Amino acid sequence: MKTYVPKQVEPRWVLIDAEGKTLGRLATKIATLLRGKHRPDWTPNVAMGDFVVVVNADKIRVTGKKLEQKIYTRYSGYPGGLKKIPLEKMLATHPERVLEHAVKGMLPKGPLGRRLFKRLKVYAGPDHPHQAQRPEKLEV
Amino acid sequence: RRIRFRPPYLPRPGRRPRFPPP
């Protein structure tokens, strides 16, 4: 008897209020939703997980002195091209990047991991455009 | 900046070509 593999499945759209949630710990959950690993029919080689919409990212939360000390870093390829941008500033300029960059790092590398990232739709502020998909609210 | 004078290990090229072989 050979292991079960799903035929193509229509993916569930789930929605999550990020407000006040502990950044990183929200982040791990979103990944599992993303990979599909909450589903009993999980298959490692195909995009069979959820689409996660997060809202109120600006209002992510964080322990210790990370606001002032956690530094996101970008390398340009040029001499002297390391950019160090601290979490405070990041939220202050592209708040949605904070959760995004957290989640990214906790998905697999590779083509599929990259596709899974594309299924994460993160927003600043209460509202999001995917009314069409009628996303199911999750409390995590 | 090294003081102990650094002798070359190699001879400055070069002498002669093994021309031809045929």
């Binding site: 340009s76 390829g77 040029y78 001499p79 | -």
Partner: protein, 204 residues
């Protein structure tokens, strides 16, 4: 934050208070407004200006239509000035007054595939004392095994010129509205005949 399209015509100098004033002359007006950009509609604010008249026999239908909608006869060139909303539906050189100071963009003269010396004022080689065929060569480009590679942006021979250059804080010396002439003091990118943009200056 006004601005205007125009073509560069040339240089002379004038005399003002017993001084020679090198000037470039620019034919600026008249530039009809042909689209406005609005924050509601566009996300920001600027005028699309037209400039120089065009033979409607050469104006393809998608373009003819854009002009049409803006109730404006065909123009050779369309360029936006950013964050500028003129009251009128036509911008002319009148918006500059002698003594104002402005910035001018234009496209620099192409120099084609330029060596390291013309491009980057490298020092080239000796021309004697033993120099072997390296008299305009760039020299070393690297280190050794560390880092074993070349920097991005290492200055090198390549194309040079025929680029956007904006030259800043030039003095308007005179404006001649009877002829659409702008006399800016000093020198502006591009060949006589080039197209230029004249904006109110940012340096204060």
């Amino acid at each position: 934050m006004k601005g205007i399209l125009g073509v560069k015509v040339g240089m002379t100098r004038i005399f003002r208070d017993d001084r020679a004033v090198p000037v470039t002359v620019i034919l600026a007006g008249p530039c009809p407004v042909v689209q406005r950009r609005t924050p509601e509609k566009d996300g920001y604010t600027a005028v699309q200006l037209g400039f120089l008249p065009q033979n409607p026999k050469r104006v393809n239908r998608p373009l003819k239509g854009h002009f049409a909608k803006a109730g404006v006869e065909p123009v050779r060139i369309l360029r936006e000035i950013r964050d500028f909303n003129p009251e009128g539906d036509t911008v002319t050189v009148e918006i500059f007054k002698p003594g104002e100071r402005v910035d001018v963009t234009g496209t620099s003269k192409g120099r084609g595939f330029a060596g390291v010396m013309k491009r980057w004022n490298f020092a080239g080689g000796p021309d004697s004392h033993g120099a072997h065929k390296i008299h305009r060569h760039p020299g070393s480009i690297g280190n050794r095994k560390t880092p074993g590679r070349v920097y991005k942006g290492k200055k090198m021979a390549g194309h040079y010129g025929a680029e956007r250059v904006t030259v800043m804080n030039l003095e308007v010396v005179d404006v001649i509205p009877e002829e659409n002439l702008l006399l800016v003091k000093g020198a502006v990118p591009g060949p006589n005949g080039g197209l230029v943009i004249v904006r109110e200056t940012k340096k204060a």
